[PDB]
Amino acid sequence: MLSPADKTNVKAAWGKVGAHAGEYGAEALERMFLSFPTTKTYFPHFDLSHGSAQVKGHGKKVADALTNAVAHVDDMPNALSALSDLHAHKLRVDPVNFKLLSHCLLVTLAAHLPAEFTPAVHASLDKFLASVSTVLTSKFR
Amino acid sequence: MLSPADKTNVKAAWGKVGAHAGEYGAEALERMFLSFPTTKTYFPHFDLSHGSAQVKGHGKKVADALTNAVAHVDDMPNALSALSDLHAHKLRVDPVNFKLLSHCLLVTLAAHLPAEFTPAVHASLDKFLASVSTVLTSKFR
Amino acid sequence: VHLTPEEKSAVTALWGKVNVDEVGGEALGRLLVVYPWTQRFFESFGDLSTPDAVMGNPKVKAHGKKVLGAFSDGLAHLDNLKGTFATLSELHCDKLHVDPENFRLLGNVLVCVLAHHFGKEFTPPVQAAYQKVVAGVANALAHKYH
Amino acid sequence: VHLTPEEKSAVTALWGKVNVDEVGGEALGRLLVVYPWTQRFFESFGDLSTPDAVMGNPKVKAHGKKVLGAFSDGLAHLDNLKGTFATLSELHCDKLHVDPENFRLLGNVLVCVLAHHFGKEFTPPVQAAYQKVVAGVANALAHKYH
């Protein structure tokens, strides 16, 4: 349950991310691949090499999803209907990986928005990513 | 989301447990503690010794809940509201633990309901506890 | 990993009673029915549309025995699981790209079938001990992932 | 852990630059803040009502340098986190009754704090390294639970 303050925090947070969201997405994927090499069994057709266009590209894709989820902080289930259709019925990504993508997202955020990455921001952002992973894995069964 | 069929199976199997839910409830618990001893950390004030009266008392309450949740198959979140509040605000029981106990509850019926424990039901049943677990963990945040 | 001798023996004892031909089948079969997303890896197997489609599938049936046999062999080297599963672990990663979690689903499914077939004979502590085994096999199978 | 010679120095050298006091206090501070339920154990600390109220609590900061210390000490026995943490392992279980799960949370939170602190320096591969340690440490503390 996102609190108005969380929503506010998120908006704030990501507001900052601004034009580097794609770069971050990119960074966070690369970061997941390295730290949790099992997350890779889902991208056998990618070039997981440092600075790959596939990862860059994909980095972009996710960043954007994230973005849309923020402006729609209030109606995620609806805004991410298609992504959850895809992940539940096509991709079929095991839920625990979301926990890993999310961690990774926050590692990168913190490394990049020091002044903004406060305890309460951190908290909101944990909750939100958590919120979106919940959306993404709800049509699982 | 339980299908009509899911529902039907749950009703049928729980139906057969009927009368022994308490002892199955309790056995599930012993199964739990014995197989996953970290779960024990939440009952530090309990006599966990074999044939513990604390444990059997405890198992009864848990099958009771299930029976009531079975009975409110169409309104679980509300019927279980009471209990959801407890585990989320008092007990503060890690969600992980839940998948451990559904596990053993699943294991116990299997050993008690041989003719009923078909793939279809095993399947419906897994979905159900998965569902009950979901409600119980809803108010964590 | 941490199998006391009495756990080690209780394990072995029961395992004496198992019909790997048929237990394999029910484990895999049931796997495919309980967690239908696991179907994705055997699209090759044909009809999996129904529980009977699956349970009965001769293909499902045979793979199950292959699986279970690999497993049985693993029971005979409870001291060097990692090593025992070394080549299969790489295969699972490098070739089938099977997320390792899949291995703990099979582990749990399995415990159910033992429960199912052994009933009362499958006591808490025996459950307890089997639990360590599949825990250990899944870890074993995931060791070479990268 | 299964730390690469190479990975062992990255870990080793970053840490070298750690302001134990500072890092210490913020990780535990952020623990309680990001995961409220973790405060069910530090009732005794006082006002944990608010972020600033938590981050401010000196009993909190104090406890933090104490934990980081142990961590710090464990980084020097990366070949034996198990034996290094056994006594502490029995404590959290037998005395504290902390579910091994919270160990994992802290791990992450320390990663986030380090990420926070070193910016650029906190490279993917170097994150890749620490991740493996928070991993081992968490696991070693969990070790003696029963």
Ligand code: HEM
């Ligand atoms: C924070 C949660 C996540 C978000 C917001 C997210 C978002 C997205 C987006 C926007 C796409 C693009 C789909 C398209 O090509 O139209 C996508 C696809 C994909 N996602 Fe996710 N994702 C998340 C988590 C994950 C995780 C944890 C994994 C696996 C570990 C994953 C695996 C994939 C894969 C394999 C694809 C397709 C890539 C390709 O084949 O090009 N996703 N996701």
Ligand code: HEM
């Ligand atoms: C199938 C999932 C579960 C169900 C249906 C369930 C049900 C219940 C019920 C009905 C109560 C008693 C409330 C009362 O006093 O009126 C209870 C209490 C409790 N539950 Fe759960 N529970 C579940 C999972 C868990 C898990 C996984 C844990 C921890 C590993 C847990 C820990 C506790 C504890 C510690 C208590 C309080 C016992 C006492 O001090 O008397 N529960 N639960």
Ligand code: HEM
């Ligand atoms: C501990 C559990 C498991 C063991 C011991 C095991 C063992 C095996 C063995 C011995 C083979 C044959 C190797 C070969 O073809 O050279 C195999 C193949 C395979 N395994 Fe596993 N397996 C396990 C779990 C799984 C799971 C859970 C999945 C999917 C969710 C899976 C997916 C596959 C697939 C798709 C194949 C190849 C099928 C084919 O022949 O086309 N395995 N496994």
Ligand code: HEM
């Ligand atoms: C691997 C990570 C951790 C390490 C190395 C660690 C280490 C320590 C140490 C050295 C103490 C000293 C207390 C004494 O000697 O009496 C302690 C106490 C304590 N720890 Fe941990 N800890 C860790 C994680 C956690 C987590 C994640 C929690 C809870 C969420 C926790 C809860 C506690 C509590 C409640 C105490 C009691 C302090 C006191 O005596 O006032 N610990 N820990």
